[PDB]
Every structure is written in C-alpha cells, then in structure tokens.
C-alpha cells in the first residue's frame, strides 16, 4: 500500500515515481535533437503545442510556441515535458546561472549548471512532500577552452554529457540514426563546419520524425566560436537548408 | 535619511475660486552650489490632488512613489467615482507615515503639502480616469477645497493657504496681510508672484524660474514654466 | 486507484488526474471570451448560471478586472481563487513599478502569474487553484496581445479565446470570419449574436443584466473602460432583432 | 507526527489514548500511602532478579523536595522524566516565591502537566499514575493522587497500581486517624502484601516527617513481614 | 480516520459532536437566578470515604463576583477555569471596574473554540454554568463544547440534567425571593440526586446584589436551608 | 507533516533498508583491494553507445589528495554524498590543518546516512559507498551501507553477484600482495563477473600509490594493463 | 496524514508496538556479556561473522569507550549504536566542562535513556533499536554495570547477558558468578558463558572480543584484549 | 464517497465537498431577511429560543455606525468574523479619519474565507453573513463559505427560506420608492411567511440603517406596535 504513491523504494528497489515522471515526459511527444561538431553545437526542436487537455486552435499565434530557451547569452537550453514544469525549470536555471556569476565573478559553465540542476532534482526525488518535475532537457554551450559541450538531464536527476542526443519518444530507435550520421561525418572552414552541423541536425530530425518538417514547424539554434551567443536561426535560412537537404 | 544634501526651497499653495493654485521654483541646491536648475518639485497623485515639497530630494521622490502607487491600487479596485480617495485621505496617510518614521527615529527631511478638492459633485473627470495621455471653470465653495501641511515631527493641520521653508516668513506675512476670499485667478497669480519675488530677493536658495500648477474642475493643469518679471 | 487523491502523485500512465478534475470543473463554470480587433480588444463574460437568482442588482456581478488601467484580466472559475490571483498580479505590478519606475511588460506578468499558479500543484497540503485566466492588452504600435493561463500552469498566446461552458461553439463562431480587420465598435453585434445562439439559457431580457463587457481600444485612449449603456443597448437591440427574423 | 493531534475523541465520547495509559498504569507495580497527625507512610513493591540485579538502582520511592516525596506506578522512563520536570518546577517556585513549594501546589502542577501532555498534538499521554505526600503551607500533612488523565484528588489513605481496587477496599475498612508510627507502618505493609508475594525483598517502605524522609531498615521490615505472616496463619 | 476539523455530510464537526456526547456524564448541577441574586448548587458525588471531601470541589470562583460549576472532563474544566480567572483579572487590571459575566463567557467560548485554527489540539469536552452579578443585574449563562453560549433563568447540567431542567420548568416562576430560590434549587437537586441529601452530600454557592461578592455556603447555612426544606 | 516514513515492522528488519540493499544488489559491480603498499578501487561501466563520452560520467572521484571513492547505486545520491564528503573534508582541514583521516570521514558519512534513515519525510539512500585512502596510520578501505553501518575490509566487492565476486577475490588474495598484482586481480574479478568482453572504456580504476596522490588511471594505462 | 505511521501512539494494552519490535530486533543481534569483579568490570561479547576478508586488526564492532572510566557494549543496530555513542561522548565531555570533574556513570546512563525516551514520546520518529551495557568506575559508587533498552529503561546488575540466547548466558552467570572474583576468573567465566551461549564447546579466538576496566594505581584504565591475549586465555580455559 | 476526507481534494466531477458541507451548515441555521428601498435598509430575523427558560439568542449585530450584519450558521465563526470586521472598521477610522468603504470590507472578509479554504489542516467557516449598510447608498451583501460575495436588493438566509424568497420575489417591485414604515412592514411579512408559531417582541429582531439614520435596533415599544400593525 502506497509503495508507489510517494518517492519510496517499494520492494525490489524501484522508485516508480521516477518512471512515471519519465513516461509523462515521453507522452508529450515533442522531439528535440542536439548535436555538437567542432567549435559549433546545434539544438533543434519542433514548434508545436504539447499534448494535454487543451488543443491548438486556429486563433493561436504559432510563432509564440517554442521549446528552446536560453539560460544565458552564451548558454542555451531546450526543455521538453509539462509546460509549467518546463517554465519552472528554465527559471531555476536562469537563477542558478545568475547566482553563479554573482558569486564567482565569471560566467557559469553549462556542465556546472547541469550538475546543479541535477542536484535540485535529486533533492526533489529524496523527499516525499515534493512532486517530481516531469521535464527533461538539454543544455549547450562553449567552455573556457573554446570547445563545444552538450549535456542532457532527465527527471531522475541523471545529468550526462553527449555528442549527439535526442529527447522525446523513439529515443531508442533514434540513437541508431544519430550514430549513423555521426559516423558518416567522421569520414573544414570554421563556418563550413557550422553549416555541416546544421544540416546534420535537420536531417536527423527529418529521419526521426519521418516527414517534411515545414520551416514554420521547426526551430533551430546554434552556438559557435564565430558568434558564441545562443542565437536561433530565422525561418528563411531554415527553409533554405531544408531545400538543400531535398 | 541621515541629513539633507540636495534640497528644495519652498512652495506656496492657496485656494481661490475655481480651485487651488500651487507654485514653486524649479531648482535643487546641492548645499551652496545650485547644481540642478530644472526640477519638478510639484507632483500629482490623481485628479484633484497634488503634493508639495520643500526638503531633501530623495525622501520626496520616495514619498511620491508611495503615493502614486497607492493611487494605482485605489483605481484598481474602483467602481464608482465616489470611491476615489480625497485629499484628506492622502493627508492623513502621509501624516501617519511621518509619525511612524518619527517613532522609529528615521524621519523624512521634508515638509509636505497635500492640496486638492475633496468633493465629487462638481465634475465627472474621475468616472473615466486616464493616467497616460490627457468649457468654463466652475466656482468652488472654499469648504470643498483642502490644503494640508505635514512637518518632520508629524505635525499637521489644514488652512486656506500654506507655505513651507523660507516662504513661511515672507510669503506668510504677505498672505496674512493681503489674502482675500474668492479672488479670481489673476489676483491669486499676482499675489503669488509678489511673494515669490520677495523670496527671490531675500533667499539664496530660491530662483526666478517658476512652476505653477492649478487644481480645478478641469483637473490638474501644469502651466508652462516662466521667468519672474522682476 | 489512489492516484487521484493527491496533486503530488503521478499516475501509472504518467498523468495528474487531480489537475484534469480542475479542468473539468472550470469547463462547467460561466463562460468568458476575449478577442482583438483593429481599434483594440474586447473582453466579454457571460454569467448564465446566475439567471435563477432574481435578487442581484443589474450588472453588479463583474468578472472583468484591470491592472495598470491598461491590461485587462478576466477569469472563468472559482471567485476566491480568481480574486487571489488578481491580487497577486497587482502585487507583482507594484513591485515592478517600485523597482524600475515603469509598467511591467505583459509577457513578464503572464510568466510570473503562470509560475505562481504552477507553484501550487506540486505539494500535497496546498489546494491547486481552480481557475483559468486571460490577460490581454493593446497599443497602437504593437497591436493587441492575448494570453491564456490555465491550472496546469501553461501560458499560450492567442488572437482570440473562449473558456468555460459551450467554449467549443463560441470558438467555432469566432473563427467564422477574420476579426483583425473589424472595428471594436461594430464587433459587439457579432458577440451578442454568438452569446444568444450558443448559450441556451439567455434570452432578450437576460442580455442587459448578466453579460459583462469591456474593451481596450483607441476610443478609450487604449485604457481599460467598461462599455456604457448608450453603446451597448443599440447593438443588443439590433442583434435580437436580427435573430428574431 | 510533528505538531498534529494524536489524542482525539471517540464516537462514544472517550479519550482512547488516556484509557490505554490507564491500562498501562494498571500494569505496573503497586504502591500505598497513609497519613496521620503530622507524618505519612509510603510503601511500594519491589521486583528484582536474585544474584544479578542491583537493588540500589531502583528508585520507585523518591524525594522531590526538602519536604515533599513521591511514589508512582507505570512506565519507569516517563516516571523519571516527569520527576525531573517536577523537581525543576519545585526549584523554580522556590526561586520566585522564597518559600518551599507546598504539596498542594506541586500536585496541581503534576496534574497540569499530565493534562497538557494529553491535549497538545505530537505527544502521547504520560503513562504513569503518581501519588505525592507532603506538608501544606500551614505545616499540615496531606497526600494527593494523580492519574494519567490529569484528574487529581487528596486522600487519607490510597493505593495505586496492580490490584489497586483490592488494596483500596482493604484500606477502606481499617484506616484510623492519628495512628502511631509503628501502627501506620504495619498497616501500610499489610496493605501492600495483600496483593503481593510475602517477602522482605518485595517492599521498600519509607516514613515522611517534617525532619526528612526516613527509609525503614531491612531488619524492621523483616520483623514486620514475619509478624504479618504469622498473623495470617 | 479523519482530521480534528473534518465537516460531516450534515455540516457538524465530528469532534464537536463527540465532545457534546461526552459531556453528558458527570455530577449533576443546578443554577437559578432571581432579582436578589444568583444561586448554584452541585451534586457533590463523593467517592469512597477515604477522600477528604475538601480536595474535590465542584463550585469554583472565576472572580470575586462570578461563580461556576463544571461537568464532563475535570482536567479540561480546571484549565478553562484557570484561563477564565486569568482573563478576568487582566480585565480588572486594564479597567478599574470588574469584568461583566457576558464578557467572561465570551472569552471562555473563544478559548474553547481555539482548537480550530482560524495551541490547542481537540475540543475541551466540558459544559460550564457561570453565574454572577454586575451593575446590569444578576444572571447566569451556559456554555457547551460547540462554543455557543446561552443565558438562562433556571438550568441544570450533568447526568440527569433532563429531569432537573424539567422540574425547574415545572416550578421556577419569575418574581421569586432568594429564600424561595434556595429552597427550590435544593428541592430539585434532592429529587434528581440518588442518595439522601445531607450537609456533606451537596454544596451550594450564591452571589447577592447587595454584597456583589461570591459566597459559598458552609455546613451551617446548608443545614439551615435543609432544615426549612418543605417535604 | 514530518513523520518517519521508515518504521520498525514485526521482527523489525527496517523493510526500507532492505529495499535499498536490493537496489544496490542490482547495480553495476564495484570492488576494492588493500595491498602491501597501496589500495585499489575498481568498477565496471556498462558498454556505452557511441553517443556517450566516458569523460562526462565518472564513477571514481577523489575527496582529498589521498582519498578515493567508488559507489554502486543511484547516481544522484552518489553526487550529493560526494559533495557533502568534500565539504566535511574541507572543514576538517580548516579546523586541524591537515588531510582528513579516513576513519573520521567514514564516521561522518555513516552518521549522515543514519540520520537520513531516521528523519521523517525522507527515504534511505540507495547506494553503497566504498572509500579507500592512505594516512599516517597506513592504508584503509571501508564500505558504507544504506543502513549507515560501516565495515573495515581488506578486500571486498559490491553490486551484482557480489557474493560470487567476493568468493573469487578471496580465493586469490594475500596480505602481502603487490600493488600491480592487486590491479591484476581486480581486473580478473571484474572480467569474471562481467559475463562478456571487457576493454578500455568498459572499466575504471583508481589507486593510492604509497605516499603519492590518489590517481585515476587513464585509458591508455588500463589498455596496457589489459594485455 | 493518510501515510502516517502511528509511531508515538499507545497500543490497546499500552505498549506503543514500536519499542516491542525494537526489542524483538535486539533479541536477534549478537550476544553481549557483562560481569563485575573485585578487580574490574568485563564486557566480553561475540563477533558476528560476515566473511573471512574483514580486517582482524583492531576493528572492534561491539565494545566502545565513552570516557577513560566508562565503556559499553552494543547489542543492536550499528548505526543507532554509533550515533548514541557519539551523543554519550558529547554528554560526558559536557559534564566535565561544566563541573571540572568526571561524570558518574549513573548520570550518563540517565541522560542517554532520557534522550531515548524523548525519541519514544515526542514527534513521530521511530525509536532507537539499540540496547547497551554501560559499565565503568567512579569514586562515589565504585564499579557499576547497567543495562538499557529502547524504552529508556535502565537497571543495575552484578552480572548480565543481553542479545540472542541471553537466557542461557544469564542462567550460566547466575549459576557460577560469585560476589568477589579475580579479574582472571571473571574473564574465564565470561569466556565460558560466551562459548555456552554460542552453542560451541570451545570458542574460537577469531569469534570473540574481550575488554575490562580497572582502577590500577588510582588511574582507571581500559584494556581491550587482542588476538594473542584471547588465544592465551582460551588455552588457559581449555586447561581448566 | 472517499473524496470528502479533505478540503483539498477535487472530486471526479470537480467539487469540494467540505465547502458544500459548510454551505449545508449555513442552510441549517435559523432564518433572516433583508430588504432595501430608495432610502433605509431593513434587516429582520428570528432569534432562536431553545427552551422557555432561555432568552432568545442575539441574532443581528452592529459592526460600525451605519453598518450591521446578520448571521446564519455556526455562532463561533460569526463571532470571529464580527470581531474581524469591527477591528477593520475601527482601524480604518483611526488611521484615515473617515468611514470604511463597505465594498473593501466585504472583499476582506471574502479573502479571509478564501485563505481559510485554500490551505489544508484548516476548515472553511460554516457561517453566512448578511451585510447591510448605507455608504452614500443603501447596500446589501451576502457571503459564502467559499470565497464569494454577491450584492442583493432582497435576501434571505437558511431555515425555511423558500417562503420568504417567494414573498420577496412576489413584491420586489414595490420595495423601491416606499416609506420606511412600509419597508419594515414588508420585512416583517417576509419573516412571518418563513415562520410557518407567532412573532413576539422577544423572539424577533429588527434593525434599520439609512440616510441620516445610524444603525439602531427597533426598541420594544415600536416593535410591538409594528407587530400589532402587521397582525391586523
């Protein structure tokens, strides 16, 4: 009784609340793909409503919808899960970055931010009166050594680095596609690499989702040594890249 | 908080037919330096209400913030034109604030004047208020106008004319000697001009660049600044 | 099976039932709609449930409030929770003005209110707010903005929205035509016709004592203003005459 | 839990936790108290494992203050906690009044604290029944009895603990006023042995006077128990 | 199974109902008011003979001019009485005059309901009969666990209170003299009580208008009143 | 609202601690050996796909310049316990100006785990720490448990099939084993328990080399050792 | 509220049902012995065997010391044991700080039992499932020995055994113990009781641990026997 | 079924059962009725009498000059709310030297209702109030256990309110533009209709508050005169 109503171990050592939160994150069926190259990292997602009681209406500003935010000018993020949970998580990330800058005098690194967010998620999992935030996410940035870095975190508080990762449904079937594309890449100018990474991300999302990915239905952002700021590409260039892929 | 640094000179408020008229010089002296010669020392809380100033600038600005946001809160829960607070309300509020600060021994180095109309039977301006963006005057019974004074120690009172700073000696004498009842706007302006000229001649902190505001049935009117004829 | 007794417990299917119940409760309360036009935006609320009560004063129950006199905020749900959220919005605006000597931008206020609402859906002791809120504004340069926050704590931007009873029929009516080119003054007729048609509890006599109206448009200098009778009555009469034929 | 009501009314109007505390009290050892003229007698049962347990460790009969003394029946740890609280209260009274605490005041305080632990959340009732003997402010001897529910009452002769009803019935037909010290000790011993095995190692009786609380010597107790055993047979 | 403050389907708090049921047992008490003053009498249910009979008192004094009589849980009654007298003396300190009986019962009810957060943890489960005299006159009030207090002219509380109040209804009549009130109260108490009335079997107190001071009848007064008792 | 979620059952047994132990018994194995002139903590990380980088996830940390640690259980609990252990070592150094003794730090961590087992509204930690170190009092290798009780080992294994691993390790072990021989034995035990094929990026090792800083072997070193 | 455990709540017969389970767990732990002699107090115990790889050197898992004159032995959960030992050390040193004198054993046992009672009564926290045998020496009373339990109950003893099979060990102690005894005879009796309770004819030097406290030369000191000493002791026992 | 154990659990249909039970308790109380005209607001009620040796319990209450309320439900909650409102009015007059805005006071009491119902471990007040006042205009307000308030022109509380409500709706259009005497008479008619076994100067409470007419309960003589007038 109540072996799974709280964050309690239950028999055979299983915190079922963790799995239920992860499955709730999965149910949103919003896909996000992150891929890093050299001096560049690209994060792409779909510009669509999540899955819940409310459905999208005709009188809905589709530009306003977006699944990618930025914690700091240089550090970018992409959340997927319950909308309120995503907003709370991005606000916590902003707060942690700001406090780190205030208390250390230099801009935080995405690795430390991921670790701190994982620590908060661990605190939530530990106690009983706190509900779990069903919102997974990816963070991207550039470190002091002028190199890209990309990390992922789940509702279980398990932060892990990656060189190509996906959040959403069909992740298991998508790791194969990401591996194949990265292997093909392994077989360049500072800007040509940016273009290659962007086309790789777009192609990966196309293959995983298996349809057109209308330029108005997707959103892409990139951080690179050329710019170093998390600036999201506009619709026209996304459409141009998509036409190139065709 | 610990002592005046940047200070105003004085204000003069008098009630006349069609409303009230309040004048003040546009200068803030940094001791004996006269750094700023264009400063708005007469604020507005709402239609039919204005706040005077003679003292430290920071405290006046803080009090202005407090009063304007109190007015915003009042409007937010307003449903009938009779719900707007009257000058008596704001005067009592500032008196309470000053008394509390005195009891805490952290006063505001100011001498405030709160002046307006505490009657709503003369105009329909407050039925549709407009904070952003902006006929004949109606004679007002002197009983419907309000002018209230507030001292550092919380001392407060009401009268037909009030002055602060050095105006409490020159302008007060002139008003007590010559002030009449139900004087037209021209006569009130002449009297205020005489008082402010006298202050300009015998007051180092004063100046001749003058701001004059009128609270009447049409609302609050900021007249264009003018230099004293001298 | 015990997964709906607390807002802090996830279901085996990964779903908070305690919030879906709030959604269902909200969907049964009085209906409120708001949309944007060329001149400005109009917010209307329909208090059809109170038709049984014959002792309430005419147009005394108002569900439309304002912040900064230029942002319309309305709700559809529990009165107490809605009032609490309105006071929180006023407090947020007050803190913003104290800190920065400037009115709070709308897209920040909506985010703050969404966070405040969401903060009550992850503890067991607190009771989640049962209310759906709409915040809208309009200015000559940036045109009208409309946002809708909901119990789950999700804020989305709309060009026209309806919440509460019969929301589907009202929405169907709204997307019948494009209102971005209609004027605020002549949109009242269409609103009245829609509330007469969709709702099956209101009639000619109910239209002047149960429906609350307001706009933020150029006529009001882009400031909140309740619609007066001299304007409302002609449109109401014309709409009822058109329906009768 | 923490700061949450645990003792609540039952459908019939009974405080079940209080009755469970009373049941626990009925589980512990027996105790008897008598008073007369200007002195009292306190007796309590003893139960130790021969050759292993140290008798000195047991503190069933204790002295709260220069004059007052106490006996109890029920849980021992709660007994110690409440005794420490009572001693602290006695010294606080002596600080704030510059006069030794009268027996009535300390009995009132014990009742008050026992009631408090029954009416505040997060704490379960004190499972002990006590009886205090002392002198009133006017140098008059009195003994009170206090229960887990907090109800207190002054008695001329009383018994608590297991089989308290039987010993009470025995006292009700033998108590006499202004008895001699030897007679009082004999009556107390007879009463405690009425519901207790006969042996000099199952009783530790003491006598309260204005001077101090005097524990009766083992030889006298042996003589008394032998005499009562002879009379019984 | 439920919190202390859980509403019932009919709108009554469960704990309050259980406390009201609990107060139905205890010593019987009766109170009467007349133009000359207020009188209170108690059953004085004496236990075994070994009790002093002085420690067990059912008629306490909240203040010099106020009397009381409890029933139900004794410890809770003593707690309420302590708070009542503390507040009465606080009133006397703040105002030279003495506290009115109405105000005292108001404070006692406030404390009794303090258990609901709107500290204590459950209803007190006591029923009090307060009686006294003030400049306004002599009067008595009745308080129950639910908090609702009511003024009374002649009332009864405790086990068998139904019979005592029935007799008071059958007999009590306005414009009565103080001696008449005393004899009536003792008649009713004797009727409802189990054993034979005696000097030590019952206890009485009274507050007069002229004196305005609480006075508890001793063995002599009770013997006198029983002697002149009609039978 | 703060009540004990872990409570004694009939016969006690603290069921929640048993479930935490069950969780630990299902995680990746990790073992340690105390040698003549050094201590070793080794562990196995599941063969990662091409997208993970072993440089981002580390199951071997260091609390001080001489103390190393390995775990088997919940990664988040491990991270928080690691942070608190670092903080405890830092404050000990601030007070006594030296490297924290292994026994003292083990005591603090065990007390923290016990408190988390006792306090209300929380659940026991789901890992089993393993701390090795060197100090003026020679070498040390301790094991913490979810119950909060520590053991002083000479050579031990934790995780899946920890009984078989412990038996195998006991079969070939000596009090006077050389550090290289201890590394070899650890590798052999991990390979036997793996039930597959091992290689670089599949194992991790840390060693305390005499009076030298605790070292986490790099990929090339373990690759050379594997041959 | 729905998930409350009902910890500090009287049972229908007034037992709280939690101290009961704690004591039941106590009865399953290894056995601990305690004796008082004319030369000192002994707290011989039995070590639970987990594996053959545990460090034999030092590694005392049953007997600890709280001060130079006070030392005890555990028969329950090790975590609660450790934290209670820390509390006892804090209390002893606080007493020394306040009064500039060593704390009598009775004071320390009273304090520790008070904290156990507090954990048993207030809050909703579960009780401590550990029972000690505090023994030591002080000028006021001399050699002493006590025995606590989760309920915060304590009692003095001249010879006792607690833990699993405490009944047989107590029977042996009652059968053989004498009012006065040499420290050597006390150690022999403790070893015999440990062997009998373990159901082993001859104890194994690696399966037991012994210690004793004595006031030699006016300076109370404790000695914890090491493997060689216990080996010689068992050789002597086998000889007799 | 099992969603009524706490006040923080929404039922599958989305209703709070504890607040509904508080409303039920309010309904179970005694009767009351309020009416207003162009000027003057009249409040009336039936003081409950439990026995012939019990004076009827006070029903109406005065919160401040020109402000009075009537209660229906739990008496303790009524006392708490009355103290709150009296302190609010007194503080407002103390630190502003003017009468308090009645609408703000109703907002404050409704907000107290809301705060109490929101957080767990606290119960919703099971009492309903009938605020009547003259703040430059006659006003009648009603509150509920859930944070909610409405403003009426003719109101009734609890008991057998059906008869009073029917009478009020049957004669509402005459209340406006009628003298104070007829207003009092109509209020008495409504109360007598709810009575369903007679009105006496002891068991009935009546109060009036209007222009240049501070809240004052009707004394015994005038109350008896009006009772005789209605009787005929």
UniProtKB/TrEMBL annotation, chain D:
Instruction: Spell out the InterPro entries in the cross-references.
Output: Ntn_hydrolases_N (IPR029055), Proteasome_alpha (IPR050115), Proteasome_alpha-type (IPR023332), Proteasome_asu_N (IPR000426), Proteasome_sua/b (IPR001353)
Q: Which GO terms describe its molecular function?
A: endopeptidase activity
Instruction: Quote the SMART domains the UniProt record gives.
Output: Proteasome_A_N
PROSITE patterns, sorted: PROTEASOME_ALPHA_1 (PS00388), PROTEASOME_ALPHA_2 (PS51475)
Q: Does the keyword Cytoplasm apply?
A: yes
- UniProt domain Proteasome alpha-type subunits: residue ranges: 2-24
One Gene Ontology cellular component annotation held by this UniProt entry: nucleus
Q: Where in the cell is it found?
A: Cytoplasm; Nucleus
Q: Which of UniProt's keywords are assigned here? A: Cytoplasm, Hydrolase, Nucleus, Proteasome
Which BP terms in the Gene Ontology apply to this protein? proteasome-mediated ubiquitin-dependent protein catabolic process; ubiquitin-dependent protein catabolic process
UniProt subunit comment: The 26S proteasome consists of a 20S proteasome core and two 19S regulatory subunits.
Q: Which family does it belong to?
A: Belongs to the peptidase T1A family.
**UniProt cross-references to PANTHER family, sorted A to Z:** PROTEASOME SUBUNIT ALPHA/BETA (PTHR11599)
Protein's recorded name? Proteasome subunit alpha type
Q: Name the source organism.
A: Plasmodium falciparum (isolate 3D7)
Automatic annotation (TrEMBL), chain E:
> Which superkingdom does the taxonomy of this entry point to?
Eukaryota
Give start and end of each Proteasome alpha-type subunits domain: 1-22
Q: Which GO BP terms, alphabetically?
A: proteasome-mediated ubiquitin-dependent protein catabolic process
Q: Which SUPFAM superfamilies match?
A: N-terminal nucleophile aminohydrolases (Ntn hydrolases)
- The main location class comes to cytoplasm
Record's keyword terms, sorted: Cytoplasm, Nucleus, Proteasome
Note whether Nucleus occurs among the keywords.
Answer: yes
The protein's location, in the record's own words, is: Cytoplasm; Nucleus
Q: Which PROSITE patterns match?
A: PROTEASOME_ALPHA_1, PROTEASOME_ALPHA_2
GO terms for cellular component: cytoplasm; nucleus; proteasome core complex, alpha-subunit complex
Query: What assembly does the database describe for this protein?
Result: The 26S proteasome consists of a 20S proteasome core and two 19S regulatory subunits.
What family, per the record? Belongs to the peptidase T1A family.
Which protein, by its recorded name, is this?
Answer: Proteasome subunit alpha type
From TrEMBL, chain G:
Quaternary state and interactors: The 26S proteasome consists of a 20S proteasome core and two 19S regulatory subunits.
Could you list this entry's UniProt keywords, alphabetically sorted.
Answer: Cytoplasm, Hydrolase, Nucleus, Proteasome
Chief subcellular site? Answer: cytoplasm
Q: Which NCBIfam families match?
A: PRK03996.1
Any one GO CC term of this protein is: proteasome core complex, alpha-subunit complex
Q: Where in the cell is it found?
A: Cytoplasm; Nucleus
- Species annotation: Plasmodium falciparum (isolate 3D7)
- From the record, give the transmembrane residue ranges: none
Gene Ontology terms describing biological process: proteasome-mediated ubiquitin-dependent protein catabolic process; ubiquitin-dependent protein catabolic process
Residue intervals of the Proteasome alpha-type subunits domain: 3-25
List the GO molecular function terms.
endopeptidase activity
Q: What is this protein called?
A: Proteasome subunit alpha type
- What family does the entry list? Belongs to the peptidase T1A family.
What the entry lists under InterPro entries is as follows: Ntn_hydrolases_N (IPR029055), Proteasome_alpha (IPR050115), Proteasome_alpha-type (IPR023332), Proteasome_asu_N (IPR000426), Proteasome_sua/b (IPR001353)
- Family matches, as PROSITE patterns: PROTEASOME_ALPHA_1, PROTEASOME_ALPHA_2
Automatic annotation (TrEMBL), chain H:
Name all Proteasome alpha-type subunits domain ranges: 3-25
Broad class of where this protein is predominantly found = cytoplasm
Example GO biological process: ubiquitin-dependent protein catabolic process
EC number of the protein: 3.4.25.1
| Compartments reported by the entry | Cytoplasm; Nucleus
Keyword Cytoplasm tagged: yes
Instruction: Tell me the GO molecular function terms.
Output: endopeptidase activity
Q: Which UniProt keywords apply?
A: Cytoplasm, Hydrolase, Nucleus, Proteasome
Question: Record keywords: Cytoplasm included?
Answer: yes
Gene Ontology cellular-component terms for this entry are: cytoplasm; nucleus; proteasome core complex; proteasome core complex, alpha-subunit complex
Q: Which domain of life is it from?
A: Eukaryota
Q: Which PROSITE patterns match?
A: PROTEASOME_ALPHA_2
The similarity comment for this entry is: Belongs to the peptidase T1A family.
Q: What is this protein called?
A: Proteasome subunit alpha type-1, putative
